[PDB]
Design a protein around this nucleic acid. Structure first.
Ligand SMILES: [Zn+2]
Ligand SMILES: [Zn+2]
Lengths: 214, 116, 49, 10, 98, 287, 217, 168, 87
DNA sequence: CATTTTGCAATTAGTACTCTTAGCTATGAG
RNA sequence: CUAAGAGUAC
DNA sequence: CTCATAAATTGCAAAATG
């Protein structure tokens, strides 16, 4: 039963990273849920037989007041987890229709191993609903806590306009960040949105850069 | 592995399953020469090879001048003189253990310690 | 003691240009190479005619 | 390609 | 080097005749099973045969080269571990006196 | 004090630098890189001094890595579009039985390791059990593509008589000798592959030959006199077809040899390499 | 390492064994194939004791008579935390019920792995001649396609003792020793997720892996 | 002076004795390979380390012996030219000649020169130059130093070419 | 041009003349002096055009303005008189 | 639905000096 | 004059 | 007799299958 224990430990770490990601995105997530210990997660999200379950592991998050004030165009968010190792067309279709009928603009899908190619094509739903796929294995360790990784803060549309006005920049003259970078996926960047990067420089104490998503 | 060849057409012999006696039986693939198998072993593969480290030893190996001499005890003659050379197995991970050939008895003995 | 031949003289390993160097064994080898390549640029009498 | 920059292919 | 010379090449027929007279087994009827511990004789890279007593052959070849019968530029090599005898007489080889 | 050993071309002292090259008729085995499908390559740069003096690079290559289970040894015969398996060549030369081929390649019955490595070759060539079949297989792979089915055999014979290892012999009836040499090359390749010997050092100075003025002028004059004699033959054919008078002076063109030698010595280019002939350095006696 | 177990040498050894990639090639001394007509008695006497336990502890009428025998290394089982049970379970898991595998105990004088291919109930009049080759094929993949322990692209691991500047509670900076792992080969994504190490402070020479795993910054 | 040369010779002899003992322990198979490398790699590492620290100790003895009026010592102390290694090589010991980061290789079959028997791994047989430039080099050591300097010149040419390309 | 020219009241660049600005000012002014430009400073016997330009810049008597181009194409006009030569 | 495999040439430290050789070969026809 | 080549300096 | 011509990087589109 060692494999079950290591799998449930990895799942707990992935859940912690997912909660941290959602809180970083700007939603209202309490610190207590982030710091949930192993035994509490085992008691709640794992059955008596010892097999963890995912259907009751999916949850919903809502924007906090600060994000609503700063981003008056983003609403509630949904996080889902798949049970079977291979995600089929039917389950992804059920997830996307559930997102559409529940009126969510962003829904993070978390899969075990992979997604069938016939399911990727239907992942981009009708706007403004957006579906983001994340692997549990890739979510075991939160990259943003690395000392190499600096602080990434998404800018609002007003802040981006002010930035481009003050620095006289064009869209392309900013430093680029790919819309496939692990941090860009982490914070849910869409193309055109500029992130502010706070870095602990060694010539000055703090350095602020700005990367535009491409 | 101690392979053998057919004595009828000078070709290879391959193992064959039998049903009446349920025994291994070597047979030819072009003349169907059939005989018994001395051993059940049919294939050997050496991931780590112990033989071949002393290969190339010849009765006049001492005539080679480049081969260095030594006076270590011979545990068949108790004589001093002998020729010594390192392991012939040219693998990069072989140990530098020496080998010795006595010029009187031609008994090859090494300088190992775990084996003894 | 199992020798088969003898060097006529070790100083014969050097070439024509490096046989001019005095005490080449008391020098750093790149200096010997420099002198070997530099004595061909040396000025003297190439032929008596 | 090419070579360089076979073919493709061959 | 000061004493280094380059061979000019000689006809290898006399050396082949010497080898054949001195007991070189012809390569046509060489069956390795009946002569396992045989030393292979190479002349200018052409495998010419095998010998069963390479020590005496090398000794007499050395004597003939040392008495002037064989041109001294001819180089003879006896690799005991590989059990090979290599004779080179062609031009271009660089040798030194000893 | 002047020592000689140099030429005077158009009043300039020209010396022929000793050109270093790899020796001929020596089998050299080299380990190859991991990505390449061949792990070891055994080659000979065969050449006969008393013949056409043409280079045929026979290579014996060991396909498949250490982790690969299908290790087939393939040889690169000249004028052949494919790497023919060695057993096909052995059966073509006249050695059909597996035991005879393995004896011609391996010398120790107790050396079961080499036999185990060699079993893929015989298992590959088991499809052919006849000398005529193997010669027909080679002729089918023959890149000339101008021989009928019945005569491919003969054509293959030519490939196995005058192009395969010229340094051994150019006549017939010596198929056994070339089979022995092929077995020796395969034996060297296996010994290098079985970690029983280190790969040959390319920089070993005993594996190199220095062409001095002798061999250089010899091959240059060989080419130049081939030119002159071809011109003689062309002139003879022209004057016999046109039935004009025949004269020796009108046939030979001494300008051919003279100009060829004078150009190849005046300019460093050795043909029709570079820097073979150089202006003799007269700045100092040691120079 | 994790700050709680920075100086714990045995936990560092545990982590090293957890990430060090291991293959049967580094363990198997040799491989062989034998003809055993019946899977109840073996013609080899030395390993006989093995079966007289396993057959006693335990189907057997549908097994190929060809047996694949692997002889392992005791020193390989010593320097690496590997046992006969672990490798046997690995092989059984990766080959399902199609290969019946037995192994001697660790304390036994010789480490022997014996494998037999199960026979399908349908009669085969041509597979029997070629069965041996099939076994060979299996042996080949069994040497490299599977992994006992560790994560991929990790050829070898070395454990060093570095010495860092830690702000002591009294205020100064102290030279605290630490156990650090250097790894030949880079599998940053798989190594970072391994529990017991510090996920934050992992670093790699290959900045391509850093960029594709951690980010452009 | 005489006592310092005697002490330098004693240091070289002690280092050679330690190398011989390491060679015995390797040849008697009692040597264990360091984790992460083979037996030959560890043996060569230990031999090179011992010879390097031997040359360093001999150079340190020579440098300590050099009086303050010594001109080479004066130049080194001023930092204008020279260093400790130059004093070590000129006065105490030239050291170990290395090719490709390893000791002198067996260009001939299993031996560096036809003046050494096969499989001779002693320091003198593989390029160690125990003689200072004041004392002069033996023929074999002269050749090994020539190989080392050849590697130096080749590396200089290759490095300047590659650095030029990188700079552009 | 009106859109490009940032008004003097809100120039956001350093008020100190840069080494490149000083070098080009000295070069241009020395060139003009060499081509018989009028001198706005009294001369104490100096004859080198470069030192003439230096003496002119010491008391800010050079009738030129720098047009500093921002990366977007906008420019700021800094008169040499109001630039402070500190280096 | 899942792999899979294969064949090679262009471009790659700066300057700076001196000297040597050669420029479609031979044959037809106006 | 051009091109090619060789040797050479740092 | 003289002019005119004989190391290491890259950068993939096929073709085959079950
Ligand atoms: Zn038969
Ligand atoms: Zn004895």
């Amino acid at each position: 039963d060692q494999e079950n224990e290591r799998n449930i430990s990895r799942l707990w770490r992935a859940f912690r990273t997912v909660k941290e990601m959602v809180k970083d995105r700007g939603y209202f997530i309490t610190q207590e849920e982030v710091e949930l210990p192993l035994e509490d997660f085992k008691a709640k999200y794992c059955d008596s037989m010892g097999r963890p379950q995912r259907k009751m592991m999916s949850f919903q998050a809502n924007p906090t007041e600060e994000s609503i004030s700063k981003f008056p165009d983003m609403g509630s968010l949904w996080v889902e987890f798949c049970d079977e190792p291979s995600v089929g067309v039917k389950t992804m279709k059920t997830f996307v229709i559930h997102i559409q009928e529940k009126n969510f603009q962003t829904g993070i899908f978390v899969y075990q191993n992979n997604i069938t190619p016939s399911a990727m094509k239907l992942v981009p739903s009708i706007p403004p609903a957006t579906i983001e796929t994340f692997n549990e294995a890739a979510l075991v360790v939160n990259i943003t806590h690395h000392e190499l990784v600096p602080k990434h803060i998404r800018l609002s549309s007003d802040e981006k306009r002010e930035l481009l006005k003050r620095y006289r920049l064009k869209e392309s003259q900013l430093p680029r960040i790919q819309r496939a970078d692990p941090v860009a996926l982490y914070l849910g960047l869409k193309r055109g949105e500029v992130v502010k990067i706070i870095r602990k420089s060694e010539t000055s104490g703090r350095y602020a850069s700005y990367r535009i998503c491409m | 592995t101690t392979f053998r060849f057919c004595r009828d057409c000078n070709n290879m012999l391959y193992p064959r399953e039998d049903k009446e006696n349920n025994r291994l039986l070597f047979e030819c693939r072009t003349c169907s020469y059939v005989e018994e198998a001395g051993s059940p072993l049919v294939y050997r593969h050496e991931l780590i090879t112990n033989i071949g480290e002393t290969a190339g030893v010849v009765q006049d190996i001492g005539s080679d001048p480049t081969l260095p001499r030594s006076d270590r005890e011979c545990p068949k003659c108790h004589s001093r003189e002998n020729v010594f050379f390192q392991s012939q197995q040219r693998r990069k991970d072989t140990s530098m253990v020496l080998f010795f050939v006595c010029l009187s008895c031609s008994h090859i003995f090494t300088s190992d310690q775990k084996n003894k | 003691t199992t020798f088969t031949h003898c060097e006529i003289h070790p100083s014969m390993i050097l070439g024509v240009a490096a046989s001019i160097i005095p005490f080449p064994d008391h020098n750093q080898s790149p200096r010997n190479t420099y002198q070997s390549a530099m004595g061909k640029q040396a000025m003297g009498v190439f032929l008596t005619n | 390609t090419x070579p360089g920059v076979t073919x493709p292919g061959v | 080097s000061l004493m280094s010379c380059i061979s000019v090449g000689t006809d290898p027929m006399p050396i082949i005749t010497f080898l054949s007279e001195w007991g070189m087994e012809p390569l046509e009827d060489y069956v390795p099973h009946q002569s396992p511990d045989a030393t292979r004789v190479f002349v200018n890279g052409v495998w010419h045969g095998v010998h069963r007593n390479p020590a005496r052959l090398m000794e007499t070849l050395r004597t003939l080269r040392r008495k002037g019968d064989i041109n001294p530029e001819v180089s003879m090599i006896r690799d005991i571990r590989e059990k090979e005898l290599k004779i080179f007489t062609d031009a271009g080889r660089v040798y030194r006196p000893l | 004090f002047d020592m000689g050993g140099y030429f005077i071309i158009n009043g300039s002292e020209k010396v022929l630098i000793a050109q270093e090259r790899s020796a001929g008729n020596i089998v050299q085995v080299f380990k190859k890189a991991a990505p390449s499908p061949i792990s070891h390559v055994a080659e000979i740069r065969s050449a006969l001094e008393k013949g056409s003096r043409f280079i045929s690079t026979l290579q014996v290559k060991l396909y498949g890595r250490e982790g690969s289970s299908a290790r087939t040894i393939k040889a690169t015969l000249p004028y052949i579009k494919q790497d023919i398996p060695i057993v096909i060549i052995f059966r073509a030369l006249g050695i059909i039985p597996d035991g005879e081929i393995l004896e011609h390649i391996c010398y120790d019955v107790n050396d079961w390791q080499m036999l185990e490595m060699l079993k893929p070759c015989v298992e590959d060539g088991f499809v052919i059990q006849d000398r005529e079949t193997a010669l027909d297989f080679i002729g089918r792979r023959g890149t000339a593509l101008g021989i009928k089915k019945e005569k491919r055999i003969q054509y293959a014979k030519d490939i196995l008589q005058k192009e395969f290892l010229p340094h051994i012999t150019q006549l017939e009836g010596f198929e056994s000798r070339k089979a022995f040499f092929l077995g020796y090359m395969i034996n060297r390749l296996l010994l290098c592959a079985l970690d029983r010997k280190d790969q040959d050092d390319r920089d070993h100075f005993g594996k190199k030959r220095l062409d001095l003025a002798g061999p250089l002028l010899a091959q240059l004059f060989k080419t130049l006199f081939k030119k002159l004699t071809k011109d003689i033959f062309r002139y003879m054919q022209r004057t016999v077809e046109e039935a004009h008078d025949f004269n020796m002076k009108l046939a030979i063109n001494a300008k051919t040899i003279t100009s060829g030698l004078k150009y190849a010595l005046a300019t460093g280019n050795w043909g029709e390499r570079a820097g073979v002939s150089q202006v003799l350095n007269r700045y100092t006696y040691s120079s | 390492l994790e700050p709680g177990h920075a100086a714990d040498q045995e936990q560092a050894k545990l982590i090293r064994s957890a990430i060090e990639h291991t293959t049967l090639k580094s363990v198997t001394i040799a491989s062989e194939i034998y003809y055993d007509p019946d899977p109840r008695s073996t013609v080899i006497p030395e390993d006989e004791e093995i079966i007289q336990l396993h057959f006693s502890l335990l189907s057997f009428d549908q097994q190929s008579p060809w047996l694949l025998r692997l002889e392992l290394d005791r020193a390989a089982m010593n320097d690496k935390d590997l046992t006969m049970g672990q490798v046997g379970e690995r092989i059984k898991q990766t080959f399902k019920n199609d290969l019946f595998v037995i192994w001697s105990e660790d304390n036994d004088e010789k480490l022997i792995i014996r494998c037999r291919v199960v026979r399908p109930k349908s009669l085969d009049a041509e597979t029997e001649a070629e069965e041996d080759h099939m076994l060979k094929k299996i042996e080949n993949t069994m040497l490299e396609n599977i992994t006992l322990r560790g994560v991929e692209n990790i050829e070898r691991v070395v454990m060093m003792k570095y010495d860092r500047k830690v702000p002591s509670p009294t205020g100064e900076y102290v030279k605290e020793p630490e156990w650090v792992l250097e790894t030949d080969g880079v599998n940053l994504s798989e190594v970072m997720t391994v529990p017991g190490i510090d996920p934050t402070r992992i670093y790699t020479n290959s900045f391509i892996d850093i960029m594709e795993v951690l980010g452009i910054e | 002076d005489g006592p310092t040369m005697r002490e330098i010779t004693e240091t070289i002899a002690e280092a050679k004795k330690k190398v011989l003992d390491v060679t015995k322990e390797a040849q008697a198979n009692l040597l264990t390979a360091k984790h992460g490398m083979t037996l030959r790699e560890s043996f060569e590492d230990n031999v090179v380390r011992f010879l390097n620290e031997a040359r360093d100790k001999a150079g340190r003895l020579a440098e300590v012996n050099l009086k303050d009026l010594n001109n080479v010592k004066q130049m080194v102390m001023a930092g204008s030219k020279g260093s400790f290694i130059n004093i070590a090589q000129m006065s105490a010991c030239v050291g170990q000649q290395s090719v490709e980061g390893k000791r002198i290789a067996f260009g001939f079959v299993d031996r560096t020169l036809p003046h050494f028997s096969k499989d001779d791994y002693s320091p003198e047989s593989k390029g160690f130059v125990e003689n200072s430039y004041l004392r002069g080099l033996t023929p074999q050591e002269f050749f090994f130093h020539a190989m080392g300097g050849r590697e130096g010149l080749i590396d200089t040419a290759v490095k300047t070419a590659e650095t030029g390309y990188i700079q552009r | 041009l009106k859109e490009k020219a940032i008004p003097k009241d809100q120039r956001a660049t350093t008020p100190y003349m840069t080494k490149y600005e000083r070098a080009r000012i000295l070069g241009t002014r020395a060139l003009q002096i060499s081509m018989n430009a009028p001198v706005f400073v009294d001369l104490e016997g100096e004859t080198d055009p470069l030192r003439i330009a230096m003496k002119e810049l010491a008391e800010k008597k050079i009738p030129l303005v720098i047009r500093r181009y921002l990366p977007d194409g906008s420019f700021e006009d800094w008169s040499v008189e109001e630039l402070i030569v500190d280096l």
